[PDB]
Structures are given as C-alpha cells and as structure tokens.
C-alpha cells in the first residue's frame, strides 16, 4: 500500500518544508498529509520556495494526499467565517494539488448531542460538502472520540443523514478500536466512504487519554504509551492485510518524540513485514 | 532596549532555525528566546546545522536569551522525571549559551491552593533552583493567570517563601495588567527579581481568554483581539519608558497569524517611536 507522512508530527520542531519533502522521499513515503496551518503559512510566506518543491514532487513519487484542518460548524461558530476558511482551503488544495480536506464532526461525543443539535450539524456538514463539491473536492470526517464519529453506528448514521456524494471518511483505526468496534469490521462497513487512513498505536488502553487534542498540541504533553504500529495493542497485521489492496493513503500519524527516527524505523518494517 | 523574538511565535508553520536566525538578524532583534521543545529537537536531529548557526550568532549581535519550557512540579507529577528534564535543559542551555530557563509556578490560580499545597510547591521550586544554581543558571517564573504568580502580591509572597538567589521573574505585562495590577508599579515592585520581559497586547479585556494555553497551542485557536503593542489596551509607551534602561531582553511574544509581518512591522515602530 501507499504510506504518507503527516506534517503535524513535526509541530514541535523547527524544520522546513524542503527538509520534510526530502525526508519523505528518502524513506519511501509516497505522500505527505499537510496540516492546514502549515499549508496556509507556506502560501503566505514561503510561496516561491514551496512552488519550486511542488514542481518536483512528482519526480520523487510524492504528492500531497490531503490537507488536514478543523472546521467550526458548532452553534457558537461564526458560520460565515467558517465558509470563508473553506474558500481559502480550496485555494490551498488547488495549489498543493489535493482533492481532500480532513475535518472533525463536532467537539463533543455523539451521546451528548440532542436530536436537534445533531440535526443542525448534519445540515452544516451538508453545506460544507456542497461548497467543496464545486471544486471537485471531498470532505473527510475523521473517526474520533468526543465527536459525532465516536462510534461506528453513529458514523454510519451520520453518513446516511447527510447523504451527500462528497462526504467521505478518514478512518483512524486506533480511535475506532478505542470505541470498542473491531478494526477490520469497521473497515468493511465504512468501505464505501473511506478515502484515507490514519495508523497509530498505543501500548495499552490505560494510556488512551494521551491522544486528547489538548495533550497532543501541548509541547510538554504526555507521550507515554505511544508506540510503533507493531509494538502496540491494536493489531496492524490484520488491518494492513485488509487495506493493502485499496488505493487510499495510510498516514503514519505519530504524535510522539523523535519523529524522524520513529518514522524511518516504521517504513523499514512496513516494507519488509510478513 | 534589547528586543528578542520567541520561536514559539512560529509553532504553527514550517520554518528552519537558520531562517529564524536570519529573520531576527535582518529585523534588528538582539536575542532569540528559544522554546524548549525547539531547543531539544535541534539538539537531537539538527546538531551540526545548529552548531554552525550558533558559531555566527555573535557576529550578528544575536544570542539565545532564555529557553522557555514547562516544569511539572505538581503533586501528581513524577518528580524524578522533572529533575531529569532539568538536567537535560542544563545541557541545552550550555550548548545554546544561555543562563535562563522559564517555567510556570503551578497549573491553577493562587486562590485555589490550600496552604499545604502551596508549601509543597514552594519546596519543589526551591529544589529546582538549587539544581540550576549548580550550573549558574536562573529559574524565571513567568507572571501568568491560573498559576501561583497570577497576582502581584502572590508573586511577591512566593519569592519571599522560596527565598533562593536563583529564583527570578519573567515579567509578562499583559498578564500583570489582566490581574488588575498597574504595569509600571508591578515593574517597580518586582525589579530586584526581574531578568526578562514578555511584551504582548490585546484590543480589549473581552478577548483575554485567547491567551489561555490550550487556545494558544491549537492551530485553529482563536486570535481575535491580539494586536500590535501600540494598538492595544495596555500602555506600552509607559512600560517601555520605565524598562528601557534595564539590561533585560523584552520578547515580542506574538501568538497571532502572520508572525513575520507583525514582528517586522513592530521593530520598525519600536526603533522610531517617541
Ligand atoms: Cl511568500
Ligand atoms: Cl543531529
Ligand atoms: Mn488521526
Ligand atoms: Mn508570556
């Protein structure tokens, strides 16, 4: 299958886009999943250096797989401001040559929505899908705890409620496993909507809270329990056997220390495992 | 006075240390306040490129003013792990040639400590001071809401309770103003302990919550109300008149968008204002 690197793995170190691309290339990645804030800042302040890089990506068998961001469609949100952000993301996706935008479906668990709140959010996701459909771009909701996609049945339900051809899924197997669902079974049920994967692992359920966004974004955040794919509790042998003959990128979503060492080691094992 | 740039201003963009140093130099900064995670990652993965930069800093009238980090000395903390982090920070400070480490005094407001919790934290700050004193390095507590330094009297009290020669203050005037204290008066009272400043401003008290750490660290975090120094509610004319003939660096602590544009514009006004 095709592996991608996420620039979010480098959120706590000083490194240039040029050096990320070179690292991706020399380690056999075929894609880069570009964090939205990185995309935006390259466009504003590194436009020429970035354009030169983009013009050789293809020569290195690299591409931008997706831009991964956060669209606020909560009731408290200034929705016109969210729409303006979508329009800027479509500009960035055009420049980076990607047709996918990752977002999250809400900021609390499905069980905590009233049927009325869940209705208003379905309508807003639909609106965002119709905006991106003009640009022939897909909106991928990531499967995540504390969102509407925090369980397999809620995710399936959401997809049926929005009922739009440009709404797709970024399947994050760790979070799917966390919800109590079987990873292969979730893949099989979500297959018609999947366009991308996230692969990460944890040593034990005891440490799942290290993936809470606030902990992930904090420089001094806890990394205990974050482990390479074949060294954690989720069974990546079974997952990769299922997904390896789909066409979608799987990002190695590493949030721990020493990203380059971990990523480099991961790719050697991924290419050679049985 | 002497101005420094904080690498934390660049936490949401891909940029190299070499480009930060060059930007600092061409805009008349005389110092760089290096975020601890940036320092650590340069040491692990960019040691040669960083060493070459460090060897010309002096030629550019630049230096590393401080490494700014987070030491967990709460009761829930693994304190031996905190001590190990201090030992690594002393290694980094040696390499970067700085004698200052910024930390925060606790993770909740002074009013929320029992006299017993506050005692245990005083003892731990004292221990950290004694560790860094071996390396002839100073521990600077930053004045911050939701910490023991959230008011001027609590900060003064803390300094008297620890009573160690290596405990110093990083005076963040915005947060001091937020606490209800007068900035110039706080400078005058805290003067014997001050070794560094942070300068940032806000358009109105209504927007002070945008400085909450979780909001600051999040890529999609709100930046509304963050404004250049002379365009906000805190009076930087009065502050700079007081502090301009001290020897301490003042960092332009910008957490908003377009850091390079904002910082470049700031330095032109700072050099030329009356
Ligand atoms: Cl540019
Ligand atoms: Cl190195
Ligand atoms: Mn993910
Ligand atoms: Mn500050």
Describe this structure in words.
Two copies of one chain form a homodimer. With 274 residues, chain A is α/β, with parallel strands linked by helices. The first copy, chain A, has one domain (2-274): Alpha-Beta Barrel (TIM Barrel), CATH 3.20.20. Chain A has helices spanning 17-26, 36-45, 47-56, 79-96, 115-134, 152-162, 173-178, 183-190, 213-217, 236-243, 259-272; strands at residues 2-6, 31-35, 64-68, 100-103, 138-142, 167-172, 194-199, 201-202, 226-227, 249-252. In chain A, the strands form two sheets. Chain A has an eight-stranded parallel barrel with strand order 1-2-3-4-5-6-7-10, surrounded by four helices. In chain A, strands 8-9 form a two-stranded antiparallel sheet. In chain A, strand 5, helix 6 and strand 6 form a beta-alpha-beta unit. In chain A, helix 2 crosses helix 4. Chain A is globular, with a radius of gyration of 18 Å. The interface between A and B is medium-sized, with 31 and 31 residues. The complex binds chloride ion (2 copies) and manganese (II) ion (2 copies). One chloride ion (CL) is lined by residues 45-47 of chain A. One chloride ion binds next to loops of chain B. Chains A, B: It holds the Pfam family AP_endonuc_2.
